[PDB]
A paper describes a structure:
Binding of the NSUN4–MTERF4 dimer to the immature, but compositionally complete mt-LSU, sequesters the flexibly disposed H68–H71 region to expose the active site and allow access of factors that modify the rRNA and check its conformation. The NSUN4–MTERF4 dimer forms extensive interactions with the rRNA and ribosomal proteins by contacting rRNA helices H66, H75, H81, H87, and H93, and keeps the C-termini of uL2m and mL48 in an immature conformation. The MTERF4 protein folds into a bent α-solenoid that binds with its convex region to the surface of the immature subunit and exposes its positively charged concave region towards the outside, where we observe a segment of double-helical RNA bound. Although we could not assign the identity of RNA nucleotides in this region, continuous density can be traced from rRNA helix H67, suggesting that the additional density belongs to the H68–H71 region of the rRNA. The interactions with MTERF4 expose the immature rRNA regions corresponding to the PTC loop that forms the active site of the ribosome, as well as the A (H92) and P (H80) loops responsible for binding the acceptor end of tRNAs and positioning substrates for the peptidyl transferase reaction in the active site of the mature mt-LSU. Consistently, no RNA substrate was found in the active site of NSUN4 where a clearly visible S-adenosyl-methionine (SAM) cofactor was bound. The most prominent rRNA rearrangement involves the PTC loop, which in state A surprisingly forms a helix with the P loop of the 16S rRNA. We conclude that formation of a stable NSUN4–MTERF4 heterodimer is critical for their function in mitoribosome assembly.
Numbering used by the authors:
A (entry chain d): 37 to 51
B (entry chain 0): 79 to 188
C (entry chain D): 61 to 300
Write the structure that this text describes.
Amino acid sequence: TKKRFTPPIYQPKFK
Amino acid sequence: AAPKNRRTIEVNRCRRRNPQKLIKVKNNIDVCPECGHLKQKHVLCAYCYEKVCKETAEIRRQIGKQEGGPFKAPTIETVVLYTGETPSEQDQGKRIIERDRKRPSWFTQN
Amino acid sequence: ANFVSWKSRTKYTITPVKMRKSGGRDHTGRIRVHGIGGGHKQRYRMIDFLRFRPEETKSGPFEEKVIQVRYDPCRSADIALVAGGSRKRWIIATENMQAGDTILNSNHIGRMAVAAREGDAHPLGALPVGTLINNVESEPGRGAQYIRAAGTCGVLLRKVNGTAIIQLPSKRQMQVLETCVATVGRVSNVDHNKRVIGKAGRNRWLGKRPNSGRWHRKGGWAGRKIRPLPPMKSYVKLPS
RNA sequence: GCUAAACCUAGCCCCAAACCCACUCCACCUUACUACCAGACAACCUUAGCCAAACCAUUUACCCAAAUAAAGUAUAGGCGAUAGAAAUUGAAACCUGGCGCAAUAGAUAUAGUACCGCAAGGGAAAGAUGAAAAAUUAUAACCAAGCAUAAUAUAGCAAGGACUAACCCCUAUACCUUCUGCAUAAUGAAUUAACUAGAAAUAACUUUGCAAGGAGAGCCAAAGCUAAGACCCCCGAAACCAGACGAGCUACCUAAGAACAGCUAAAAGAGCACACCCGUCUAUGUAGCAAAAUAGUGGGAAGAUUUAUAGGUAGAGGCGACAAACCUACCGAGC
RNA sequence: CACACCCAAUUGGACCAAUCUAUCACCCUAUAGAAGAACUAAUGUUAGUAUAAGUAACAUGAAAACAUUCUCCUCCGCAUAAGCCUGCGUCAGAUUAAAACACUGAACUGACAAUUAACAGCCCAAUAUCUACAAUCAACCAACAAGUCAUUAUUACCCUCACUGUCAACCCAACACAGGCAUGCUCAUAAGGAAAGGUUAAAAAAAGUAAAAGGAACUCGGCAAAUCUUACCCCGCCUGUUUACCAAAAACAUCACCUCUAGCAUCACCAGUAUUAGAGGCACCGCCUGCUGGCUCCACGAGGGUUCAGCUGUCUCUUACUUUUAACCAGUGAAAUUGACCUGCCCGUGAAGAGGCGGGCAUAACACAGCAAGACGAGAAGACCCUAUGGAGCUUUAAUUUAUUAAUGCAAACAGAAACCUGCAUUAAAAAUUUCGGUUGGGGCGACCUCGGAGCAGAACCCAACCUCCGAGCAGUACAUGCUAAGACUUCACCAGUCAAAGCGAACACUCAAUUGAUCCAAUAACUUGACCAACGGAACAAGUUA
Ligand SMILES: [K+]
Ligand SMILES: [K+]
Ligand SMILES: [Mg+2]
Ligand SMILES: [Mg+2]
Ligand SMILES: [Mg+2]
Ligand SMILES: [Mg+2]
Ligand SMILES: [Mg+2]
Ligand SMILES: [Mg+2]
Ligand SMILES: [Mg+2]
Ligand SMILES: [Mg+2]
Ligand SMILES: [Mg+2]
Ligand SMILES: [Mg+2]
Ligand SMILES: [Mg+2]
Ligand SMILES: [Mg+2]
Ligand SMILES: [Mg+2]
Ligand SMILES: [Mg+2]
Ligand SMILES: [Mg+2]
Ligand SMILES: [Mg+2]
Ligand SMILES: [Mg+2]
Ligand SMILES: [Mg+2]
Ligand SMILES: [Mg+2]
Ligand SMILES: [Mg+2]
Ligand SMILES: [Mg+2]
Ligand SMILES: [Mg+2]
Ligand SMILES: [Mg+2]
Ligand SMILES: [Mg+2]
Ligand SMILES: [Mg+2]
Ligand SMILES: [Mg+2]
Ligand SMILES: [Mg+2]
Ligand SMILES: [Mg+2]
Ligand SMILES: [Mg+2]
Ligand SMILES: [Mg+2]
Ligand SMILES: [Mg+2]
Ligand SMILES: [Mg+2]
Ligand SMILES: [Mg+2]
Ligand SMILES: [Mg+2]
Ligand SMILES: [Mg+2]
Ligand SMILES: [Mg+2]
Ligand SMILES: [Mg+2]
Ligand SMILES: [Mg+2]
Ligand SMILES: [Mg+2]
Ligand SMILES: [Mg+2]
Ligand SMILES: [Mg+2]
Ligand SMILES: [Mg+2]
Ligand SMILES: [Mg+2]
Ligand SMILES: [Mg+2]
Ligand SMILES: [Mg+2]
Ligand SMILES: [Mg+2]
Ligand SMILES: [Mg+2]
Ligand SMILES: [Mg+2]
Ligand SMILES: [Mg+2]
Ligand SMILES: [Mg+2]
Ligand SMILES: [Mg+2]
Ligand SMILES: [Mg+2]
Ligand SMILES: [Mg+2]
Ligand SMILES: [Mg+2]
Ligand SMILES: [Mg+2]
Ligand SMILES: [Mg+2]
Ligand SMILES: [Mg+2]
Ligand SMILES: [Mg+2]
Ligand SMILES: [Mg+2]
Ligand SMILES: [Zn+2]
């Protein structure tokens, strides 16, 4: 039950 | 709730091109007797309404130059005068507004 | 770490010197002593623990007049400002010391003992047996290091062949030369141990931080485990 | 007919050859790129571990200066996995080449730039007319999915047999993978284009050469020997170790500062109650204003308080009023 | 009439797309050689575009001469510090997306312009020598936590105002983000602003207001709301502290008490010295007790229960109105999801819960708004065991170690003696590496793992695991229980095991159902011997626990 957090992935801005 | 399957274009055309979605043709359009521009039966002519507002703004600009500031509304009637006109018999004791322009034909002096 | 000790002054002065706290950190910057940090700022007042220090132009026994006995933040006991000749210096005050009193500092050892007065500094070879003493030194010219705390006092148990037995406040005997200079009587603030902190806030005023919250099952006897011998290993625990 | 689709260079890869670069002026180890004052600080020290032994604990290949051969031999080794010589032998050696790549390829590179991260560090995307742009009256036609042209008529894996005829009739339980057995309501796939996965030894076999001999020293041979052909994949952990980088968030500490109305009270880790700090309950919100907020209601609010600035402690650790808390939005061991 | 032309894994073939090379060929081919040599599938990579969907969501106070004025809000504003670095000044632009708009369009592009030191920053000749007495209106008084501000002597020296910061609607949060953000003033403004794009007034949802009669009958619970309200029990002395992002507590800390360790200095402890310091337990005080333990009790608590009274739409039983949302019109325009769908109902069947299969019934086609029964609806998290000769944290009388550190010993060395250092041993400390063998739904407690026999496959052989039951891990007689050697059996492989004529040599293949253990290694002159290696085809030596 350990708290698992997945940070959001920011795509490169050039797209 | 997420879609279980992708809706096909054939299904989409029946919804997008349904007669309700389509724009309804208007049958209330008629030509203005004065200028000939298009108008609706229950709506004032756009061309004829614009010419009144153009003249109204010029008249209201002349009022501002006479009052010379806010909170100076006159307690008497107002008369709009053009070039080549004189105050009338009933236009006595009123605020005459001079306009350096010929009187418009649609504007009838009263 | 770029740690420089504040103890850089090389000339003695009665002026309170500003000192910077350590927080239990050594020169490396890591904690070496726990529970130390914060508290009210203090200025260190240098204490001359060598009572018999004759002036440059003088020698032999000399006298000092007490100017003021005041509070010292650094130490438990109080301190006294004394003036001897043309100089002033801080010393550790005794239980009975007032402003105006005259203390005597000598290095003379007479054939017979002398009337010991509280606050005076005489060698251990000229003090009567049993008299309470404080601020003793291991050897001559070493300076007082023992029996400094408030109310502490030693006992001159015996004197044989130029050496004397000093009973420390921890009830331990110590043998030092009879030429060591000691102060007669107890130290000031006798009722220092009778104080009540009152609240946890006052302990943070003295620069002491709360103890760790970990439940330490380890201790003097609990943590250290006697290894059972193979014959005794069978009898260590019996089901009941 | 729109969106688009096509193109050939830029340059690169592997070799050969030959041993490479760095003072125009000014500034640059202090807070680098900062004209201009007493320093004394000084460098050197076995790698480890993953992995193999189907665990693991001894052990486990890593150019050390001549290709070949001796030879995988002598030796070494939980005498297991595996490791492994030497004496001795002894060859050629002419850069300007390609059954190398051609914009998702070839270097990451149009550039270590944009951008991301406090830092160490990570790391792109793309260009295309013609001899002439001082011809733009251009650079025809046709091609993915997606659309438009052109919404739909009972009924059903969407098809097949058909039929005069789209449908109507009859027949038919999607694909892959994993299990004894999948229409399975088990796994995977919106779709299009491009890219993306079987590398090698002994022996044997097959086809030539020569033959008690074979082979361009060494090696094998009781028909062998020499040469060729023909057999052994891809993605994915949590981890471990080494060396760096991080305390501008947070934990605690150091230095020197700042803040706390009014009222009741009293020289109070006192009460009420703003600023401020905290986050009890409820509701909203749940790709939200917000990778933790909003409204109301609450705890503290002269103290073990709150807070700005600079410094310190760094991962076999730090720090901790112990919550296995925190150490830059995944800390039972950071990146 | 034709005939190689309907199996998984695997195996044997015959052909072969495209490409490069050799040689041909010359509207795209041939024979060979070579290889980055063929994609309906890896929650594949990159890119394009669909689906959800023109949906969610987003925005501009009113009139007007666009002078101005009006309505409303202000929990804000101005400045400095820090940070940022030209980021709504002017002009022009084929301009044209800031989440709407836009001609002057402009928080876009290009050019031009700018912030001027008095404020702030950037300071100081040497050597000695000086500096006991807070602050708080500092005067009373009263303290402890003991504090935030000073020179002189001599020598040297009389040149002068440089340099840098100065803008803005601004910073940290991927954004023009309802968040974060130090200080001085204003404490309601003299400054700064706009909640409504337009319309309609459905449901559902959110916030708010009002309510007959009743007043907790609601509910796990008086949660919310209303009102401004009494009495206790449990736990914790109290203020305080903690899981930043689900736990604020009864947990931690805390005075007080108690235990343990230490007789001393030049970097922590400490510029200290047992009335001290450190490591800990417990949680004040008071009472009682042993020679350490138990109750009581003041306040206190967003702790956990209980209760009087009141209060109330919590409820009997809901209703009305307002605002946001909503729906429609205009502008802008996402995301999870998605095998293909031409996507009905009832029984039956079926990897057992059918829109798709069987049998019946129903059925023109299409939007829009609701609903949440189904599509074992979608995303992510987690539970549940199990598996891995997969990890990690922790603990220890798991195994393996002392390199390291400390204390000693002897050697070395000095030496009229002693130390330091070094080498080698011996304890201890603190650590280091590594592992948790299987079987019995799970756990506990026990049993089990090899070999022989029976129930046990009635008749060649083999074969019923689990299960039920009884055994074996010997002993005895020999001492040719010597040496050799045809042919066979074989526990379904191998290893191992079994029988054996003849012959030499002697005499005149021992009994027994099982009665057993490989290799390496060790010992030995040789012979030969060595393991409840019983987990019995055996790892040289490794436990427990994880909520
Ligand atoms: K392993
Ligand atoms: K509480
Ligand atoms: Mg304590
Ligand atoms: Mg404790
Ligand atoms: Mg292994
Ligand atoms: Mg393992
Ligand atoms: Mg490339
Ligand atoms: Mg690239
Ligand atoms: Mg097409
Ligand atoms: Mg049909
Ligand atoms: Mg289905
Ligand atoms: Mg299934
Ligand atoms: Mg899928
Ligand atoms: Mg290891
Ligand atoms: Mg491992
Ligand atoms: Mg900090
Ligand atoms: Mg208070
Ligand atoms: Mg209060
Ligand atoms: Mg804390
Ligand atoms: Mg705990
Ligand atoms: Mg725990
Ligand atoms: Mg982190
Ligand atoms: Mg046939
Ligand atoms: Mg070919
Ligand atoms: Mg390929
Ligand atoms: Mg393809
Ligand atoms: Mg694919
Ligand atoms: Mg919808
Ligand atoms: Mg909407
Ligand atoms: Mg608005
Ligand atoms: Mg100035
Ligand atoms: Mg204003
Ligand atoms: Mg409205
Ligand atoms: Mg609206
Ligand atoms: Mg009512
Ligand atoms: Mg009830
Ligand atoms: Mg309430
Ligand atoms: Mg408490
Ligand atoms: Mg109290
Ligand atoms: Mg509290
Ligand atoms: Mg929390
Ligand atoms: Mg907190
Ligand atoms: Mg909470
Ligand atoms: Mg406690
Ligand atoms: Mg009740
Ligand atoms: Mg009641
Ligand atoms: Mg009503
Ligand atoms: Mg719209
Ligand atoms: Mg999408
Ligand atoms: Mg249908
Ligand atoms: Mg059914
Ligand atoms: Mg049917
Ligand atoms: Mg539903
Ligand atoms: Mg689901
Ligand atoms: Mg296994
Ligand atoms: Mg473990
Ligand atoms: Mg056999
Ligand atoms: Mg075994
Ligand atoms: Mg076995
Ligand atoms: Mg067997
Ligand atoms: Mg627990
Ligand atoms: Zn008209």
